[PDB]
Ligand binder design. Sequence first.
Ligand SMILES: C[C@H](OP(=O)(O)O)C(=O)O
Ligand SMILES: C[C@H](OP(=O)(O)O)C(=O)O
Ligand SMILES: C[C@H](OP(=O)(O)O)C(=O)O
Ligand SMILES: [K+]
Ligand SMILES: [K+]
Ligand SMILES: [K+]
Ligand SMILES: [Mg+2]
Ligand SMILES: [Mg+2]
Ligand SMILES: [Mg+2]
Lengths: 519, 519, 519
Amino acid sequence: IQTQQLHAAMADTFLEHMCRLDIDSAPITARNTGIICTIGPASRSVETLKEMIKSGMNVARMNFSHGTHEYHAETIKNVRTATESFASDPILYRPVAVALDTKGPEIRTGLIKGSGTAEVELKKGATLKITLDNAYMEKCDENILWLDYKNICKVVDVGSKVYVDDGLISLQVKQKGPDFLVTEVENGGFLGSKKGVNLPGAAVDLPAVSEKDIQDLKFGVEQDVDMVFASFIRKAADVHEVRKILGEKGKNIKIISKIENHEGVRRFDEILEASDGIMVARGDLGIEIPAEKVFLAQKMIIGRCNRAGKPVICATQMLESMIKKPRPTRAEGSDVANAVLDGADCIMLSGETAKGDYPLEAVRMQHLIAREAEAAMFHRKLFEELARSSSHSTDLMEAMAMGSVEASYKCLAAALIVLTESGRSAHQVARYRPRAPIIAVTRNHQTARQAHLYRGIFPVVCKDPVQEAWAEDVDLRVNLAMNVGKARGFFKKGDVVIVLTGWRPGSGFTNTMRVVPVP
Amino acid sequence: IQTQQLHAAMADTFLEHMCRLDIDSAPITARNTGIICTIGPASRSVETLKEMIKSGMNVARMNFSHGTHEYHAETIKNVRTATESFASDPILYRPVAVALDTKGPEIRTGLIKGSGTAEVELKKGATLKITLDNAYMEKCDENILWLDYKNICKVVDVGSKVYVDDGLISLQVKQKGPDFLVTEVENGGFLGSKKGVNLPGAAVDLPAVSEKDIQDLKFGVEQDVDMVFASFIRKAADVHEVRKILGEKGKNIKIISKIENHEGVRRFDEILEASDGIMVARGDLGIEIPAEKVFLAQKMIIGRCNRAGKPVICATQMLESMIKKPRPTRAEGSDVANAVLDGADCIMLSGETAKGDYPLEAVRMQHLIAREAEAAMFHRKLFEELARSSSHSTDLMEAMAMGSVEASYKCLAAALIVLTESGRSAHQVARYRPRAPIIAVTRNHQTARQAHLYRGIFPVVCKDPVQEAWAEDVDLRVNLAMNVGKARGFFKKGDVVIVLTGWRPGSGFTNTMRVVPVP
Amino acid sequence: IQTQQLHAAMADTFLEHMCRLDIDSAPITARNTGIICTIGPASRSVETLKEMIKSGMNVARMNFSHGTHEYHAETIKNVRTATESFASDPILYRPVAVALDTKGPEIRTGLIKGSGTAEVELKKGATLKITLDNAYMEKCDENILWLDYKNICKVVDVGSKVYVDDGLISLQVKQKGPDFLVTEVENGGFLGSKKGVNLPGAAVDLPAVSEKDIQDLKFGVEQDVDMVFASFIRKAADVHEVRKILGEKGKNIKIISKIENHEGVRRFDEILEASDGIMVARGDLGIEIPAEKVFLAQKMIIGRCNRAGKPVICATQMLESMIKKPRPTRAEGSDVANAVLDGADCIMLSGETAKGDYPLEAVRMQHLIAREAEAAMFHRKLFEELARSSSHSTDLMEAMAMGSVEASYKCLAAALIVLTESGRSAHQVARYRPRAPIIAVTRNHQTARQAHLYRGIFPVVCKDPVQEAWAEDVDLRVNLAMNVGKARGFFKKGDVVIVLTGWRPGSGFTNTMRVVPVP
Ligand SMILES: C[C@H](OP(=O)(O)O)C(=O)O
Ligand SMILES: C[C@H](OP(=O)(O)O)C(=O)O
Ligand SMILES: C[C@H](OP(=O)(O)O)C(=O)O
Ligand SMILES: [K+]
Ligand SMILES: [K+]
Ligand SMILES: [K+]
Ligand SMILES: [Mg+2]
Ligand SMILES: [Mg+2]
Ligand SMILES: [Mg+2]
């Protein structure tokens, strides 16, 4: 029986491709979908980290919706420690990135009847009034509700909706005043103190960045974070703002715009153009838009990204049941397989590794489903479809990407080796979806850390100094990749590999391509 | 902004098709995807049943792995009661089908401490002895465990694994005896009473059809069940026996073989050949085979069925979060939408409706998503694909089917209207996957109940009597469809529908198509 | 308006592509299709010949159906003269090929009324007892007939047709004898003396090669011909015999099997495999088979050759008008251009250049058309189709030929440069149908000559001695192609080009690929 789901790879049609999927067809050793683990209490310890680093973790995410700089600084400190506990061997040394997950702008309610531990009960078809009179700031009750969003009137209109405490409570504006609104509880419940407000369908004035956001980004630039996951991105203008805050010191830091509402969606094109990657925040998204429409947003966002060659991340509730159990639901395993299939660059674990009882087991599972799904894609058709979208482009590095990938399918290469410092060269390739692993060999650490954002890229860091001669230095870097691949089980000695490099030092892109056999 | 993803519909490529999905493209009222519910404690009532018939229920499934014959019989009458409570308006009456889900070759444990209630905390690395000594049948405690599988000893070998309670509890065979097995608790949790045992990687010599099965089978016959779900089918053979046991009185009962294990998958082909339909048994399948490979099975089978034009049901853990929470995950919404997109004729809810606290909420959800996804399919390419797959057949009914579908895509018909008694003429169309709802008008209740099994068919029963003149009889059922369609919200006065009928009485199939406008 | 028919090349569909052809979309300087000219009286002069090379000729063909060796050897000498007349300038030198075209085995009649100039009248419904009696050998009268085809009885059954005078007289064999054939004249004419016969649909016994053919071959061998167009090939065994003859001395001689009949067509695949290439001899073909059907074979013959990677030549009457007019008919323009579209590697001129009044006017026309049709092809589609059909191949060289071809479309390279001594590495790329010219740089003459046989290949001979240092010898050779391209007007300074070279001497194939700019 044929491995790596090859026989399906020859289907002339999509139905036939499906029809040939065989569970007896072994996947390969290598996994291309990156895994982004949320770090916290259950995964914060160093030792835990080493293991998680061992299970398949590639990116440590830091959620700044909480914790103090001191906390994070510590978390961050362990990662690095764990991470580096392996550099002793440049071969078995796997880099790990670091993400700053911005808390961002919010809308909150006042104090209920003065207490912070109080509740009011809101019933269906009830008249609840919302005001901006600073007085009620601590006197919110069931007839009067006070907000912390000055412009709430300008942005909403008659008949719009408000969602208190995260979707739970909903209200329809049945009267529009200048500093108050008159809502009708529609789908009510229990209301508490300082709960989140959502205005689906609206065009929120709210600044790109919160005051807290700022000390958080600064703190990231200081901590040398590889990237930033930016909240509630609504337009391109918003992206420029974080871009500004990062300043010149963190111009290298990647900005991953997070899609959280109607706007982000309806203006996705302008956001993609300005972002460095994109995030499908299924979670917050699911609150702002109807849950049945989430899958729409997720596929469109992914296609669009795939099509444009910008990494896209699928997040939240992937393996949820697993925070408390050792095994995921059938829907969970299917959520994961499909994400990849949709073409996600990388998938993520929130609660699962942050709070959960089975963080390792959660990593391993994602590691597992991904490989299986990665082999069940339809390379031949995706590739064409992809190429046709980029026909308008005659870039040279693209041309080398395309030709390199085609060759990789033709002769069944075991891998694709790429020497690069920026990473663009490898990014270009990944963008084309080889089926085999793209082993990128860089001397720039950061470059190796941010490479994970791409599908297929397995970054290898070269610690050796620059040789006198390009040929030799080029041949050294290559051997490195070959040793690493041989040890990690990606390939044997008779395998065929595709190699991309620069003809001469300082060439511009890998403009050279050879078919070389594993020594 | 367009409706029904008609914009994504014109895409030339899949990727482009995805790139254009739009959260603002409103779906149609109609839901082609069968929704099958598992009746039990939470939804057994009548008032609840009616409520669930209004919400979306099409098929009630009686899980025969439990309860006494007199319990089901009751559940069954309530189903019928509810169903018929709306038979006043031939128009506003929706048929509901009935299924008998078999027990087959299941393995169960004994009583934990004679109580059916009592749980017991299994611990990691502990020792647990499995015996076959019936003294233990009710003394199942944390140190001794009893199974109902006599030859378990002769099929299992050392090192092997044993999975209790939906693969949650994992035990390793550390020692083999003649009546017992020494196992080590490789993965612990709380061991309840009368729980499911899976022996992955073992040859269970249990017969497909067992004595109890037979009663059950015969019982269903008695009850006038529309179809049966044969549990644990592994070979074409197993599917015959059920047929036999079912004999002449139950010839029209439709048999849905359930793919629940490795062998079942392997001999999928022969099994499919002998089956009226098929169900993807996620739960058991996910334990029998690796969790990671399940989604490969789900696609192959659906592909394969779809190709063959045989109903396929996707089942298990689709909406689990909802047994206890009013809201499904983000991963759940996926599953479902993805099952619809994969090409499954019906989706199912087991516990979400049997014990769950939000049984009615579960259905509306599956319904909500189903319409959305439905419009998110890529008709054109699917149509093309389906056609090529069935190239060797020159059948006039297929031929008739293909044209009507093709004509509906083109004029954007609101609905296809079919007149059949056997079901065939409508089954052949649903197989071509029109976008629009297939209103099938029968005079045969059963043909109408089992229609539910098909994607797009919205059965409608003609109570009126056979008019003497053909023309009038035809014109008669067409008006019923019209009214019904008109009454449901599918079409309006200026709408355009496509009508499939017999030229003359005894035509054999629908051999006359007509593009007619809604009156 | 875009050049090279590039708007049309972006069409997603064939209908769109056709719809997008622009009379104002200028072709390129370079012609891809080889032009085969048949040398005779009208162009046997060194002067005319020099003008022909300038004009476009790539291969000179010598029809051995005629002349003596004396003649030919001389015609040959003149071609070699003219060719070398340009050798002064290595950048202007253009290799020319010499092909030997075999008379091939035939069927003749006897004398008519003893007198060689005697012409009898055949009429319809008559009776013609053809005999093998040497008696009649010189007195073939309107009643009796004599043939050289001894086994004609063995080979012809009842009802079978027999053609006399290049199909002018059709005779039906109404009663077979042991050595006579009683035929009733179906379509009668003027039976002349010494006419060639044709046995449509017959399994001719005749020898692969005639006694003459043998002399001719050994001669061809002594004259250093480059390829032999073998006539009347019906099975693989025939090709096999021809090789036997050429022997060891003429091993590097390519053999182009000419498909002149029902059988050869029928057993097409066995011949293709045994041959180095194929020729669609429409002349003979449309005699042996019905004209209405010729196009079918040409399309099939060619579709099949392209699939496999074997040069294919389309012949006879493409521009016959031009024998006596300086301008071809609207119908000949289509023929030439369609053949080009069908995918012919080479195009051919016979009496148009061998006896016509407008020889040069004819080549010129072939060249104008080919450049234009060549732009009109749908490379993206073609490329995909070709790749699919080779899918069962995991050849290192094809892979390389494939990535290259693809990169070429991607960045719109102005050419592909290939360094080769066998010519294989070039053949491979050519098979894949790039849009830009394939400049092949060899140091081997036969290679360079033989290469014209292939589409896209534009052979350049490297006269400069081998360098000691690999890189230098390569770069030298690369420069040459560069200079030449710039000179012939293929590309400028800005232009990109793809270079295929061997990593190391004795690499076996061009395993190195690069995107380089014209200096
Ligand atoms: C990840 C994304 O943002 P978060 O809510 O975690 O801040 C989400 O909503 O899931
Ligand atoms: C539905 C199928 O059978 P069950 O386990 O529900 O009896 C399964 O295994 O999920
Ligand atoms: C051209 C080809 O061969 P020829 O007749 O030139 O020998 C033909 O049969 O027409
Ligand atoms: K956050
Ligand atoms: K069951
Ligand atoms: K000849
Ligand atoms: Mg948020
Ligand atoms: Mg089961
Ligand atoms: Mg001939």
